[PDB]
From a paper:
Drosophila has two isoforms of Arc, dArc1 and [name], with low sequence similarity to mammalian Arc, but lacking a large N-terminal domain.
Each monomer consists of five helices in an orthogonal bundle fold, and the structures are highly similar to each other. Both interfaces contain four hydrogen bonds and four salt bridges. The interface is conserved, displaying only three conservative replacements between the isoforms (A125/L170/F172 in dArc1 to S112/F157/Y159 in [name]). Both the dArc1 and [name] C-lobes closely resemble their counterparts in the capsids, with an all-atom RMSD of 1.75 Å2 and 1.13 Å2, respectively.
Numbering used by the authors:
A (entry chain B): 4 to 88
B (entry chain A): 5 to 88
The structure:
């Protein structure tokens, strides 16, 4: 297969692209996060991993400290995308 | 210190060419410790940084053969002593 350490390398090499939507990015990251050992990380941690990997428009507009879940994060990210076409 | 920036630093800080294992692990353990106490076990902290090492350490030290940083330092010193 593929060992935990290589997954972390993939997670942190998988940054959001300049035209990639938040729904796409979180799907991608959550799939990798699921290849990790079941029970290791809570959602707060999984959010910490990836928050800095989002594209700049989302980090400027969505303070990490205002989000507690992937649902809360997706909702604001879609909100971000729906205001600039 | 916001956990997500620490993680971004951890994985932005790969071991450089000719940087010895003590130098690299020092650096990372400093970052690993800025995280909330108790979040990660040592098995996880090794997984974080293991892929960040240079090829000679990974080529010679299988991740599955170390359980602690001390075991990692000891083999990493051995790798460096093979060329001294």
């Amino acid at each position: 297969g593929k060992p935990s350490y290589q997954i972390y390398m993939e997670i942190f090499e998988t940054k959001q692209s300049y035209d990639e939507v938040i729904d796409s990015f979180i799907c991608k990251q959550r799939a990798l996060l699921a290849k990790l050992p079941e029970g290791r990380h809570d959602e707060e941690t999984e959010l910490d991993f990836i928050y800095g990997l989002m594209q700049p428009k989302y980090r400027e507009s969505i303070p990490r400290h205002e989000v507690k879940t992937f649902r809360e994060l997706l909702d604001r990210g879609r909100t971000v995308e729906r205001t600039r076409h």
